[PDB]
C-alpha cells in the first residue's frame, strides 16, 4: 500500500493524491487506508509540492555567497591548524639532526 | 594532570576558540571508533548536496 | 541535528515575548515535546546512548498455503504470534534501577552555595561542551525542553491546553521523580536547581485546572514546594524567608 | 471580570477543527488571563544570585587563583624547616579571652 | 612532521622514476604517492564533516548559560 | 606563538566577526524593507509544502497542502484499538444520489471496518467531499446526508453469521450462490457471473478479484469493484438468511424464494457444464459508446434486484477511471504577453 | 624507510583494486563523489567518502601509537 501511494504520487507531483483514488485502486477498508494516507502526507513524502512557488531573486551581501571563503578567515571550527615555521639556527640544527 | 588539562582548557574558553582537540582528530582510530555518526552525517550532507 | 535545530529555534521564539506560540492552531507540538522528554528521561536512568546507535534502526525489511509452506520445508529437502508494546515506557518508577534510598531535600540557599562552590572550583567541568560528552548532551536537551515548556505556559490558551495533555502530566510526574529521588544522572548542579526553578514556574500557571494523577506525584509536589525555603537546626521548623 | 471555571472548559473553547454566551465569556477570559499571565518585560529579570553568575569572570578569577597559588608553592624557595607557622589566635582574640575568663566567675 | 612528509614524498617519487626497480614496488610507490598528495583534501573533507558534527551539538544552553527565559 | 602574536591573532578574528555582524544586520534590514536577501545561513524552505522562509519572521502554524489542515492523530486510542484487535468485519457501503431529491451524484462504493472506533465518520466524509473537489458550500448539500447514510448502512450490517460466529465447519456447506456482476469503468462494461460459497469463512473475495483482474489485465477500479460486489451480495444473502431464522449449523434450509436461488449439488455427471449454459459463465468486457453511456446515466432485502457499480470519476490525472481536470502533467504556468 | 603502506587496508568489504581505483579516481576528479563512485563501481558514494576519511595516511608520521605526548 505504501509503495503504491508513493509511486503513484511521484508520477505527477503537482496533483493532490487524494484518499479516494487510493481507496478505489487498492482493495482494503477505508479507515486503514485513510490513516495510512494521512500518516504519509503528515511526513511530507506525498502532496509536498502540490502548489509550489518560485523564490524570486537574492541580492546577496558579501560573505553570504557560494565561493565566499578566504584563507584569511578565522577557523573557529575546522580544528586543523596551519602552524608558523620557526626558523632559528639552533632549531635548524635540531631539525637537521632529528 | 588535572592542573594542566584544566589550564589550557581554561585558556581556550577565555580566548573564545572552540572545536575538537587538534591532536586527537588527526589520527585514524578516531574515525574508526566514531563510525556510527559519520555514516549519518555523510548521508545528511550528501543528500542535502553540500559534499 | 533535526532535533537540536528544532529545539533551538523553539527556544529563541518562545523566549521572545513578541512572537506567540499558540497551541489552539496546532496542539500536537506539545505532545512531541513531552514524548521527547519522556524518552530522554527513560534512557538517562538506564544510561543508554541514543542518536548514534550501531543498530540497524529498521524493522522488518523484506491463508491456505501456510500448511503447504510448512510441508514445503519437508518436500524440498526430499503462524507467527502476536506482539505487545506501548507508546510510552514506564514513568520512571517501577523500574528495577529506580528504588528510593534518600529523598534529596536540599534547600534553596545550600543549592546556591553548592553552585557557587562548583563554579569557583579550579578543576571544574561545568563547560566541558556538548560534543565531548553524550550525557551532557542529554542534559542540555532536557534543559532546553524545560525552558521551552516554561516559556510556552504564559498564554491564556496554552495554560488550559497544557493542563491536560496526559503526555505533559506524565512528563512532569516523570521529571519530578528524577530530580528529587535520583539526581545522580544530571551532570551539573545548576541544572538540578534550574529544573526545580522552572517546574515550579510551569506548575504556577497550570495548577488552577490541574487534576493530580497519582499520589506519588502529589507527594513529590509537596517535597518540591517544601525544598524552597530555609529550615532550622517540636516547634516551627522553618525560619522566615526574607524577600530581599 | 474574574470569569468562571466553566469558561475554562474545553466545550466552551476552541479546538483543532479540521454562540453568543460563549463569545461573551471568551472575551472576559482572554481579557483576564492575558493581564494575569503576561511576563514582565522590564527589569528585575535577575530573579536570584545564580542566574546573573558569570562563567567568564569566575574562569578568569580561577585562572589567576591557580597560577599565583602554584607560584606560591614551587617558586618560593624557602625550605620546609624555615616555613614559620602562623598564630592560631589574634592580638584581639587573645585580649577578649583574657577579659571574659576574668569575668567568668560571676 | 612537514619535513618528514616532504622527504617521504620525494622518496616515493624516486622509487617509480627509475627503471631498475621492480614492478611489484614500482606501482605500490605510485599509489603511496597518490595517497600522500591527497592529504590536505582529506583534511578538508575530514574538517568539514567534523565541523557539521560539532554544529549538531550546539544547544544554546551550553554556549549561553545566562539565557533569560521568562 | 608568543603573547604579541596571540593577541594579534585575536584582533584579526574579532574584526572579522564585526564585519560579519554588519553583514548580518544589513541582510536583516534588507528583508525588513521587503527585499529578499540571503543571510549567513541559507534560505530555509521553498514553496514546497512548508512556506517560504525568507520573510519578516512570522509564526505560521501548519501551512496546509491544498485547503486541508493536517490530520492530528490521538496516538493513545490507536494503541488502545490496535492491541484489542480481534477481528475486522468489513462492511460493503453503497452511495447513490441523483439530481432529484439531492444535488450531488456521488456514486462511490467503499469498504469499511465495522470494529474501527478510531476514525470519526463525518471527518472521513468531509475528506471525501474535498477529494471530489466540491466547493466550500458543502453543508447545504450536506455532509450530514452522506454521513447519515453511511451511519445507517453500518448499523444494518448484521455481520458474518454463525458460520463465523458460533461454529466453522472446515470446507463450509453446499450453499453456492449465483454471483452476477455488472461494472462500468470509463467506456468498458464487465459482465460476468460465477458461483460463490457463502458458507465458507476462508473464501477471500479480494484474492479472487486480484486473480481475475490479473488474467483480464483490468486497470484497478475493477479490483475494488469486484470485491465490493462479492462483499455486497454475500452480505445481502446472509441477511436474508438470518432474518428468516436459519440456525446456521444444521442446514435444513426450508424456504421457497431461497433454496431456489441456491445451486443444486454437483454430481459426478454435472462436473462439466453444458455448452449453451457455459456461455453465461464467462467474463465479457463490452465497449459502449456515448448513447449507452447516457442511457446508463439516468437509470427484507430484495435479492432479485442486483445493483450495478457505476462510479462518478474522481478528478485524478494518472489513474484510469478518473477525469483529467486540475494540475497538468507538464509543469507550466503560461505567462503570456 | 618508514613508508606508509597504504594498500594494506584490504578489509573484506573493500579490496586492493577498489582502493587503487578509489585513489586514481580522486586524483582524476577532485571531490566529485558521484564520478568517483562511478569510476570505482559497485559501491555507493557514501562508502567512498567514509573509506577516504578512514585512511591511515599521516598516522605513521605522528609521534605516538594511539606514554603520552604531554603538553
Amino acid at each position: 500500500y505504501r509503495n503504491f501511494m508513493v509511486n503513484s504520487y511521484r508520477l505527477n507531483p503537482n496533483e493532490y493524491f487524494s484518499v479516494t483514488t487510493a481507496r478505489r485502486n487498492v482493495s482494503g477498508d477505508a479507515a486503514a487506508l485513510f490513516r495510512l494516507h494521512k500518516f504519509l502526507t503528515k511526513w511530507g513524502l506525498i502532496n509536498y509540492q502540490v502548489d509550489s512557488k518560485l523564490l524570486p531573486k537574492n541580492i546577496e551581501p558579501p560573505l553570504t555567497s557560494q565561493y565566499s571563503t578566504r584563507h584569511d578567515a578565522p577557523r573557529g571550527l575546522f580544528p586543523f591548524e596551519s602552524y608558523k615555521p620557526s626558523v632559528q639556527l639552533p632549531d635548524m640544527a635540531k631539525l637537521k639532526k632529528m | 594532570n588535572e592542573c594542566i588539562a584544566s589550564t589550557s582548557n581554561a585558556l581556550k574558553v577565555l580566548s573564545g576558540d572552540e572545536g575538537y582537540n587538534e591532536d586527537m582528530v588527526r589520527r585514524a582510530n578516531f574515525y574508526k571508533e566514531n563510525e556510527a555518526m559519520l555514516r549519518e552525517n555523510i548521508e545528511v550532507i550528501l543528500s542535502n548536496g553540500r559534499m | 541535528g533535526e532535533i537540536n535545530t528544532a529545539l533551538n529555534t523553539l527556544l529563541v521564539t518562545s523566549a521572545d515575548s513578541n512572537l506567540k506560540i499558540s497551541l489552539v492552531k496546532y496542539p500536537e507540538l506539545l505532545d512531541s515535546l513531552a514524548i521527547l522528554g519522556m524518552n530522554l528521561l527513560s534512557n538517562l536512568s538506564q544510561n543508554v546512548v541514543p542518536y548514534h546507535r550501531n543498530t540497524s534502526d529498521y524493522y522488518y525489511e523484506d491463508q491456505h498455503d501456510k500448511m503447504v509452506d510448512k510441508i514445503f520445508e519437508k518436500v524440498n529437502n526430499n503462524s507467527p504470534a502476536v506482539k505487545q508494546w506501548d507508546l510510552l515506557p514506564e514513568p520512571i518508577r517501577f523500574l528495577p534501577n529506580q528504588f528510593p534510598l534518600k529523598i534529596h531535600r536540599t534547600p534553596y540557599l545550600t543549592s546556591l552555595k553548592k553552585i557557587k562552590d562548583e563554579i569557583d572550583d579550579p578543576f571544574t567541568k561545568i563547560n566541558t561542551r556538548g560534543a565531548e560528552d553524550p550525557k551532557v548532551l542529554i542534559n542540555d536537551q532536557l534543559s532546553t525542553i524545560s525552558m521551552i515548556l516554561r516559556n510556552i505556559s504564559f498564554s491564556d490558551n496554552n495554560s488550559r491546553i497544557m493542563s491536560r495533555n496526559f503526555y505533559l502530566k506524565r512528563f512532569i510526574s516523570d521529571l519530578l521523580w528524577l530530580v528529587l529521588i535520583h539526581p545522580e544522572n544530571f551532570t551539573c548542579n545548576r541544572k538540578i536547581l534550574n529544573f526545580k526553578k522552572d517546574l515550579v514556574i510551569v506548575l504556577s500557571n497550570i495548577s488552577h485546572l490541574l487534576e493530580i494523577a497519582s499520589s506519588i506525584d502529589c507527594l513529590l509536589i509537596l517535597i518540591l514546594v517544601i525544598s524552597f525555603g530555609q529550615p532550622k537546626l517540636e516547634s516551627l521548623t522553618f525560619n522566615e524567608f526574607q524577600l530581599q | 471580570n474574574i470569569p468562571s471555571l466553566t469558561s475554562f472548559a474545553e466545550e466552551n473553547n476552541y479546538q483543532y477543527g479540521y454562540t453568543y454566551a460563549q463569545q461573551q465569556l471568551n472575551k472576559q477570559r482572554q481579557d483576564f488571563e492575558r493581564v494575569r499571565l503576561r511576563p514582565e518585560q522590564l527589569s528585575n529579570i535577575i530573579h536570584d544570585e545564580s542566574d546573573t553568575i558569570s562563567f567568564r569572570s569566575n574562569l578568569l578569577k580561577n585562572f589567576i587563583s591557580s597560577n599565583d597559588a602554584f607560584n606560591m608553592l614551587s617558586l618560593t624557595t624557602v625550605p620546609c624547616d624555615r616555613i614559620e607557622k602562623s598564630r592560631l589566635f589574634s592580638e584581639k582574640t587573645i585580649r577578649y579571652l583574657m577579659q571574659k575568663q576574668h569575668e567568668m566567675k560571676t | 612532521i612537514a619535513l618528514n612528509l616532504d622527504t617521504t614524498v620525494n622518496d616515493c617519487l624516486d622509487k617509480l622514476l627509475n627503471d631498475e626497480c621492480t614492478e611489484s614496488t614500482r606501482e605500490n610507490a605510485l599509489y603511496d604517492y597518490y595517497a600522500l598528495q591527497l592529504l590536505p583534501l582529506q583534511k578538508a573533507v575530514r574538517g568539514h564533516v567534523l565541523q557539521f558534527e560539532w554544529h549538531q551539538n550546539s544547544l544554546l544552553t551550553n554556549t549561553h548559560p545566562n539565557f533569560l527565559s521568562k | 606563538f608568543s603573547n604579541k602574536e596571540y593577541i594579534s591573532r585575536l584582533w584579526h578574528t574579532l574584526k572579522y566577526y564585526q564585519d560579519l555582524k554588519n553583514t548580518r544586520m544589513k541582510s536583516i534590514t534588507s528583508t525588513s524593507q521587503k527585499i529578499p536577501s540571503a543571510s549567513i545561513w541559507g534560505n530555509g524552505y521553498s514553496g514546497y509544502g512548508n512556506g517560504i522562509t525568507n520573510t519578516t519572521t512570522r509564526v505560521i502554524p501548519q501551512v496546509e497542502v491544498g485547503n486541508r489542515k493536517h490530520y492530528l492523530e490521538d496516538k493513545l486510542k490507536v494503541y488502545k484499538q490496535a492491541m484489542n484487535e480481534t477481528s475486522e468485519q468489513l462492511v460493503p457501503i453503497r452511495l447513490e444520489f441523483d439530481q432529484d431529491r439531492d444535488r450531488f451524484f456521488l456514486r462511490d462504493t467503499l469498504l469499511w471496518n465495522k470494529n474501527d472506533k478510531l476514525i470519526k465518520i463525518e471527518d472521513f466524509v468531509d475528506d471525501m467531499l474535498r477529494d471530489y473537489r466540491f466547493e466550500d458550500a458543502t453543508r447545504e448539500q450536506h455532509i450530514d446526508t452522506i454521513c447519515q447514510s453511511i451511519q445507517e448502512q453500518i448499523q444494518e450490517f448484521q455481520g458474518n453469521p454463525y458460520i463465523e460466529l458460533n461454529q466453522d465447519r472446515l470446507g463450509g456447506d453446499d450453499l453456492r450462490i449465483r454471483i452476477k456482476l455488472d461494472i462500468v469503468v470509463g467506456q468498458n462494461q464487465l459482465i460476468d457471473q460465477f458461483e460463490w460459497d457463502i458458507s465458507n469463512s476462508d473464501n477471500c473475495p479480494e484474492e479472487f478479484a486480484e486473480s481475475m483482474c490479473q488474467e483480464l489485465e483490468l486497470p484497478g477500479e475493477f479490483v475494488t469493484a469486484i470485491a465490493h460486489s462479492i462483499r455486497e451480495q454475500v452480505h445481502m444473502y446472509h441477511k436474508s438468511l438470518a432474518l428468516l431464522g436459519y440456525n446456521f449449523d444444521g442446514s435444513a434450509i426450508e424456504d421457497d424464494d431461497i433454496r431456489s436461488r441456491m445451486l443444486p449439488t454437483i454430481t459426478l455427471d454435472d462436473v462439466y457444464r453444458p455448452a449453451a449454459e457455459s456461455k453465461i459463465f464467462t467474463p465479457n468486457l463490452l465497449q459502449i459508446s456515448a448513447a449507452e453511456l447516457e442511457r446508463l446515466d439516468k437509470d427484507l432485502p430484495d435479492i432479485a434486484d442486483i445493483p450495478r457499480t457505476f462510479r462518478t470519476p474522481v478528478p485524478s490525472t494518472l489513474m484510469p477511471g478518473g477525469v483529467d481536470v486540475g494540475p497538468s502533467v507538464e509543469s507550466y504556468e503560461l505567462r503570456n504577453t | 624507510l618508514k613508508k606508509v603502506k597504504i594498500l594494506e587496508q584490504i578489509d573484506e568489504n573493500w579490496s586492493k583494486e577498489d582502493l587503487q581505483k578509489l585513489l586514481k579516481g580522486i586524483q582524476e576528479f577532485g571531490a566529485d563523489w558521484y564520478k568517483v563512485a562511478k569510476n570505482v563501481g559497485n559501491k555507493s558514494p557514501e562508502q567512498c567518502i567514509l573509506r577516504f576519511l578512514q585512511l591511515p595516511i599521516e598516522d605513521k608520521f605522528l609521534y605516538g601509537d594511539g606514554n603520552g605526548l604531554g603538553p
Side-chain angles (χ1 to χ4, degrees):
Chain A
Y1 290 167
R2 185 199 58 169
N3 280 4
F4 163 72
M5 289 186 184
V6 170
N7 286 328
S8 177
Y9 174 66
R10 293 176 171 190
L11 296 185
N12 183 26
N14 305 85
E15 250 258 57
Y16 173 77
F17 182 75
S18 12
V19 197
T20 59
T21 152
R23 186 187 72 244
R24 282 176 165 190
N25 287 37
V26 297
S27 191
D29 63 322
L33 290 173
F34 170 73
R35 231 170 303 144
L36 167 56
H37 177 268
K38 285 302 178 175
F39 157 73
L40 262 189
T41 190
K42 197 190 206 66
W43 278 91
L45 296 185
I46 166 187
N47 316 326
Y48 191 69
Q49 31 177 329
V50 171
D51 285 335
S52 310
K53 293 179 167 56
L54 306 100
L55 276 172
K57 193 170 188 175
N58 301 321
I59 305 184
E60 309 183 22
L63 307 179
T64 62
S65 166
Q66 305 196 37
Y67 322 103
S68 60
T69 39
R70 4 206 52 92
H71 295 246
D72 335 329
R75 28 142 85 85
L77 303 182
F78 178 68
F80 295 147
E81 291 279 343
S82 188
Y83 270 115
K84 164 190 171 184
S86 65
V87 264
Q88 306 278 66
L89 314 176
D91 296 330
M92 285 301 235
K94 187 52 170 297
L95 282 169
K96 191 65 176 182
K97 186 169 65 61
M98 280 211 303
Chain B
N1 286 344
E2 292 185 2
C3 189
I4 296 168
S6 181
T7 303
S8 61
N9 184 32
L11 182 53
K12 184 180 66 182
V13 179
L14 290 184
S15 299
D17 301 358
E18 226 70 50
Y20 287 84
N21 196 27
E22 189 207 11
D23 223 275
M24 177 182 55
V25 300
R26 241 185 182 179
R27 294 178 153 84
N29 73 318
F30 181 82
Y31 313 107
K32 203 187 61 180
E33 65 169 355
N34 305 121
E35 202 180 355
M37 69 190 68
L38 293 195
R39 272 188 282 100
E40 265 197 355
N41 291 334
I42 283 169
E43 291 183 12
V44 163
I45 296 174
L46 237 189
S47 55
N48 282 119
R50 285 174 198 270
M51 184 74 75
Chain C
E2 307 283 342
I3 294 192
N4 280 329
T5 60
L7 286 179
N8 300 330
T9 47
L10 276 159
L11 183 52
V12 175
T13 55
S14 56
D16 201 14
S17 77
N18 294 75
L19 266 27
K20 52 170 189 175
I21 300 184
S22 53
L23 302 184
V24 169
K25 303 293 184 293
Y26 203 72
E28 223 249 1
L29 173 70
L30 170 62
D31 301 341
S32 295
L33 290 173
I35 287 176
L36 186 58
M38 265 290 309
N39 294 132
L40 283 181
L41 256 37
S42 176
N43 48 25
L44 186 55
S45 303
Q46 317 306 307
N47 298 268
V48 197
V49 36
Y51 312 118
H52 284 338
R53 297 172 171 174
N54 221 322
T55 64
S56 178
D57 212 3
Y58 285 89
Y59 274 67
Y60 318 99
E61 154 191 348
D62 51 329
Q63 220 62 226
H64 241 279
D65 216 56
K66 64 155 192 169
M67 180 62 177
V68 193
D69 288 338
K70 172 161 293 184
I71 57 186
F72 219 167
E73 290 195 359
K74 180 199 300 180
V75 217
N76 185 30
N77 196 21
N78 178 37
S79 176
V82 301
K83 284 186 62 177
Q84 287 291 105
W85 70 93
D86 310 329
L87 173 70
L88 310 165
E90 56 295 357
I92 188 157
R93 316 113 51 174
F94 327 113
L95 291 183
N97 173 43
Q98 290 277 325
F99 195 74
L101 305 183
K102 173 188 175 183
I103 303 179
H104 293 65
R105 302 160 299 174
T106 163
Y108 191 21
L109 302 180
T110 77
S111 284
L112 298 188
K113 189 54 182 176
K114 278 193 171 188
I115 284 176
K116 208 202 70 178
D117 289 352
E118 195 188 46
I119 296 176
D120 222 325
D121 207 71
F123 321 103
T124 165
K125 303 172 184 180
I126 208 177
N127 54 15
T128 66
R129 287 293 78 95
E132 306 177 13
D133 209 318
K135 183 178 294 297
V136 80
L137 176 62
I138 304 296
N139 294 289
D140 294 321
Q141 285 188 2
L142 289 169
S143 191
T144 311
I145 288 291
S146 293
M147 271 180 171
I148 285 163
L149 286 176
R150 83 110 81 87
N151 279 322
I152 292 304
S153 98
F154 286 104
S155 305
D156 48 351
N157 318 279
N158 304 341
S159 310
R160 67 159 192 87
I161 285 179
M162 291 167 68
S163 189
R164 295 73 181 194
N165 196 359
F166 169 68
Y167 306 100
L168 190 74
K169 300 197 306 189
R170 195 200 178 95
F171 171 67
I172 287 302
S173 301
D174 230 273
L175 185 60
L176 195 45
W177 178 266
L178 198 54
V179 90
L180 287 181
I181 307 301
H182 279 64
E184 318 137 339
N185 310 284
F186 305 137
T187 54
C188 178
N189 207 4
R190 191 171 175 262
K191 302 174 185 303
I192 305 181
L193 185 64
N194 266 157
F195 290 152
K196 307 177 188 181
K197 268 171 62 176
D198 52 24
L199 222 96
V200 176
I201 291 183
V202 83
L203 266 138
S204 178
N205 321 342
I206 292 175
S207 60
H208 57 108
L209 315 176
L210 221 173
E211 305 226 55
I212 292 178
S214 178
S215 53
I216 316 292
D217 166 74
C218 194
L219 169 62
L220 290 171
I221 283 294
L222 281 177
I223 301 182
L224 164 72
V225 172
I226 280 300
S227 61
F228 293 151
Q230 34 178 17
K232 297 180 175 182
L233 300 185
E234 299 189 19
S235 181
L236 291 183
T237 74
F238 265 85
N239 193 16
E240 199 272 332
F241 197 92
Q242 21 206 83
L243 279 175
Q244 62 117 345
Chain D
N1 317 125
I2 321 171
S4 179
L5 196 63
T6 321
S7 59
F8 291 135
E10 296 271 15
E11 311 294 324
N12 307 134
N13 301 326
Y14 299 101
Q15 284 167 89
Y16 197 62
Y18 78 100
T19 68
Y20 170 70
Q22 304 171 344
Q23 282 307 304
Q24 184 51 241
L25 261 305
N26 293 18
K27 289 171 188 175
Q28 305 185 26
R29 207 269 318 274
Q30 80 143 30
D31 289 329
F32 185 78
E33 271 205 350
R34 285 179 187 175
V35 86
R36 162 212 169 199
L37 287 167
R38 61 112 167 86
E40 303 288 335
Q41 297 108 169
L42 56 127
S43 191
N44 203 351
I45 43 181
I46 303 111
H47 334 282
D48 54 320
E49 186 249 57
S50 101
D51 280 17
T52 40
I53 189 68
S54 48
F55 282 5
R56 186 170 223 87
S57 303
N58 284 131
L59 187 53
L60 164 70
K61 190 242 295 304
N62 294 146
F63 193 91
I64 299 302
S65 300
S66 169
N67 173 43
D68 62 352
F70 201 86
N71 295 147
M72 189 190 299
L73 175 64
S74 59
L75 299 179
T76 51
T77 160
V78 171
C80 298
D81 321 330
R82 310 281 96 97
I83 298 181
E84 303 190 9
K85 304 178 181 179
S86 175
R87 279 185 280 100
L88 265 131
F89 293 93
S90 174
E91 294 177 350
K92 235 161 288 94
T93 66
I94 208 59
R95 182 187 62 186
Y96 193 80
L97 298 192
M98 285 285 190
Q99 229 181 35
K100 190 68 177 183
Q101 195 259 4
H102 175 265
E103 300 165 349
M104 83 180 301
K105 301 166 301 304
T106 59
Chain E
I1 286 170
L3 285 187
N4 290 318
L5 201 64
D6 213 80
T7 305
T8 320
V9 162
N10 297 342
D11 196 15
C12 72
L13 180 60
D14 200 15
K15 281 275 167 50
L16 54 97
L17 197 57
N18 60 332
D19 210 7
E20 73 171 4
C21 188
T22 53
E23 201 72 23
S24 57
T25 54
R26 202 169 101 88
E27 64 94 9
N28 194 14
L30 175 61
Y31 288 107
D32 289 355
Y33 180 77
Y34 284 148
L36 278 179
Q37 273 197 337
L38 256 38
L39 185 56
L41 174 62
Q42 184 193 44
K43 288 191 177 180
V45 280
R46 194 172 307 179
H48 188 197
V49 178
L50 263 304
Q51 174 172 4
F52 173 66
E53 171 55 50
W54 185 274
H55 190 51
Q56 298 287 82
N57 307 331
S58 97
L59 256 169
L60 280 184
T61 45
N62 266 317
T63 65
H64 288 261
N66 292 11
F67 207 93
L68 14 82
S69 59
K70 252 160 186 180
Chain F
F1 222 161
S2 184
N3 185 39
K4 295 167 288 291
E5 301 180 0
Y6 194 80
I7 308 181
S8 73
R9 180 189 299 184
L10 297 191
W11 277 114
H12 299 165
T13 301
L14 178 60
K15 288 186 179 173
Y16 185 85
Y17 287 157
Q18 242 142 226
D19 308 355
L20 202 268
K21 201 214 177 186
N22 284 336
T23 298
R24 182 225 101 192
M25 287 297 303
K26 281 181 175 56
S27 176
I28 284 172
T29 57
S30 174
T31 62
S32 290
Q33 290 178 354
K34 304 137 187 179
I35 302 178
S37 290
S39 66
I40 327 286
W41 337 90
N43 205 331
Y45 288 94
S46 169
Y48 308 139
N50 315 120
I52 294 291
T53 323
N54 222 338
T55 14
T56 70
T57 325
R58 298 166 315 273
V59 174
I60 303 301
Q62 191 251 299
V63 36
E64 77 309 357
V65 56
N67 291 344
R68 338 183 196 102
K69 297 184 169 187
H70 282 70
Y71 174 74
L72 292 190
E73 310 160 340
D74 200 13
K75 291 200 299 296
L76 293 166
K77 203 182 299 178
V78 183
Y79 280 91
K80 199 161 68 66
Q81 189 254 18
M83 298 313 171
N84 322 335
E85 204 37 69
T86 56
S87 301
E88 36 180 13
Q89 292 197 357
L90 307 178
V91 174
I93 287 184
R94 183 83 206 195
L95 301 178
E96 289 173 318
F97 301 100
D98 304 325
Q99 192 44 258
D100 306 313
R101 296 97 30 186
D102 295 303
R103 300 182 219 170
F104 35 84
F105 322 112
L106 224 286
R107 236 184 299 267
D108 210 358
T109 68
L110 60 137
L111 277 318
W112 180 267
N113 193 287
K114 192 177 178 179
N115 299 340
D116 182 89
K117 60 168 175 291
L118 279 162
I119 306 297
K120 303 305 172 186
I121 185 56
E122 39 260 346
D123 191 22
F124 171 65
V125 173
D126 183 71
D127 162 75
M128 182 174 66
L129 265 346
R130 278 201 183 98
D131 292 325
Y132 273 109
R133 272 178 164 88
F134 281 2
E135 81 278 306
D136 274 0
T138 338
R139 279 93 186 272
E140 81 288 333
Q141 36 183 13
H142 305 257
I143 59 179
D144 181 66
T145 51
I146 310 181
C147 173
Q148 188 251 304
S149 304
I150 295 181
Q151 188 59 240
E152 180 230 338
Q153 287 179 28
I154 60 178
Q155 193 166 303
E156 291 184 345
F157 189 79
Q158 54 100 2
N160 201 331
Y162 288 173
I163 302 184
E164 127 84 6
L165 296 184
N166 299 9
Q167 78 281 349
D168 173 68
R169 305 304 239 258
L170 181 55
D173 303 330
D174 317 54
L175 306 183
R176 311 189 317 274
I177 211 48
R178 178 134 143 81
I179 294 292
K180 322 179 176 184
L181 37 87
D182 184 17
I183 308 178
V184 184
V185 166
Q187 290 189 1
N188 299 335
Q189 178 181 8
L190 182 60
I191 293 179
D192 190 15
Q193 305 146 15
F194 42 83
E195 315 183 333
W196 195 258
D197 203 329
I198 80 172
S199 54
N200 217 24
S201 298
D202 45 356
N203 288 172
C204 201
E206 309 145 11
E207 205 88 0
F208 181 59
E210 295 166 20
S211 171
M212 190 190 310
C213 300
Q214 214 96 113
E215 307 155 277
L216 260 55
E217 305 283 339
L218 264 17
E221 279 263 15
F222 298 94
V223 179
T224 64
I226 285 168
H228 174 74
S229 179
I230 303 304
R231 207 81 57 164
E232 172 97 311
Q233 300 179 33
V234 166
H235 158 64
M236 83 162 46
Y237 267 94
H238 272 342
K239 191 175 184 184
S240 62
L241 248 59
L243 289 186
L244 298 180
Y246 176 71
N247 189 20
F248 288 81
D249 207 339
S251 304
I253 161 77
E254 206 182 357
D255 211 297
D256 225 56
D257 191 15
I258 37 178
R259 198 191 35 91
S260 56
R261 293 294 174 91
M262 300 286 177
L263 292 171
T265 306
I266 161 180
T267 72
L268 161 126
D269 170 77
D270 209 1
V271 83
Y272 287 104
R273 238 190 275 97
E277 210 177 49
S278 174
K279 291 167 64 173
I280 350 177
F281 288 111
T282 161
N284 305 143
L285 189 52
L286 325 171
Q287 190 176 247
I288 52 177
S289 298
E292 307 94 323
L293 190 53
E294 286 171 338
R295 190 191 58 88
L296 299 178
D297 214 84
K298 300 305 179 180
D299 275 334
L300 284 172
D302 189 16
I303 59 177
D305 180 62
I306 301 174
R308 63 195 309 146
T309 55
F310 196 91
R311 284 168 158 174
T312 64
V314 283
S316 169
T317 291
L318 316 150
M319 280 314 181
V323 287
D324 205 352
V325 89
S328 58
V329 193
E330 53 252 4
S331 303
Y332 288 157
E333 293 220 23
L334 239 63
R335 292 183 184 178
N336 249 27
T337 63
Chain G
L1 245 173
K2 204 179 194 299
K3 313 168 193 169
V4 38
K5 311 173 187 176
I6 238 303
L7 307 181
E8 302 199 357
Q9 268 60 40
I10 35 92
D11 163 61
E12 34 73 49
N13 195 20
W14 288 80
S15 66
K16 194 164 180 286
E17 303 91 357
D18 283 356
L19 292 185
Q20 286 163 12
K21 290 161 190 174
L22 191 266
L23 293 179
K24 202 153 79 67
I26 295 180
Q27 265 287 342
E28 270 202 51
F29 335 98
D32 203 76
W33 311 101
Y34 290 96
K35 294 180 178 181
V36 168
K38 150 193 167 186
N39 167 264
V40 172
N42 69 271
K43 266 168 177 57
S44 52
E46 291 93 19
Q47 296 167 50
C48 296
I49 299 173
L50 226 215
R51 209 57 160 93
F52 182 56
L53 291 196
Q54 297 177 355
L55 273 190
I57 298 182
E58 220 193 8
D59 288 28
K60 286 205 170 180
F61 298 113
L62 298 169
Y63 166 66
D65 299 87
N67 352 326
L69 244 179

